[PDB]
């Protein structure tokens, strides 16, 4: 519960995720809270890649 709360918070504050990606991680966290750690890591990686995309748009 608290771990899902923390995971929600971190995912919603990843600045470069788009809303489709955010929604997907939120739903995955609701479906399988025991996977929070892995899901959070995966979201951070997508955020990293989105940041690279923003660099290449620029």
């Amino acid at each position: 519960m608290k771990e899902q709360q923390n995971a929600f918070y971190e995912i919603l504050h990843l600045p470069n995720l788009n809303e489709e990606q955010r929604n997907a991680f939120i739903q995955s966290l609701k479906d399988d809270p025991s996977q929070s750690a892995n899901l959070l890591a995966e979201a951070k990686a997508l955020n990293h890649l989105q940041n690279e995309v923003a660099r290449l748009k620029k």
Partner: antibody
Amino acid sequence: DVQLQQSGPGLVAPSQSLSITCTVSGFSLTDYGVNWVRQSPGKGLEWLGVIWGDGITDYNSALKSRLSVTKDNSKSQVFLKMNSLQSGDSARYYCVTGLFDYWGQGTTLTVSS
Amino acid sequence: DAVVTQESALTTSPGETVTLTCRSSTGAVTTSNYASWVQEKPDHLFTGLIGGTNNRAPGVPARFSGSLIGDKAALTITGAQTEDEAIYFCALWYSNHWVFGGGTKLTVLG
């Protein structure tokens, strides 16, 4: 004007390890990631790992226990270390930016059987 | 354990349009695979072309473009040039690692 310049010893035969330094200019390592990839003489491209702006590092899971990718944000340098080398690690090693958009010039490593 | 597959070879000629594709064994290529394309020319010289499905790297000529077509990623050269004869690799991101395709040898005849 992005530039990735590779240096370091490459192979150090006294240990059986590889050390490569990638010096980057044109962007801050605090913001953007750097990949390492290799290409063997008769194979394709193999991704080794990436170090992101915040220091998080993702590794190739088949090689992770032998790999260390680190960086110095102030020197704009990224360091690849690969240990316990075998002849199958002979390859050209490249540092690259986050979506493979800019490549270093490569470092050749040949490990004898 | 994803496998990325590309055409082994394609042949075009100057001024034609050619599309190279990049297939994922796990299903459709999507935005979150960040499909990226690199050119290898002789003496092991690599140049990035497209990153994150459809973004041209700085300095890359306008004739290169990237897209998703059906279930695959695609690199299109609209008006091929003789210097575009080269090997083209695609790379796809899978949750926590990159996987490269085997490369396509593009011949530009004439």
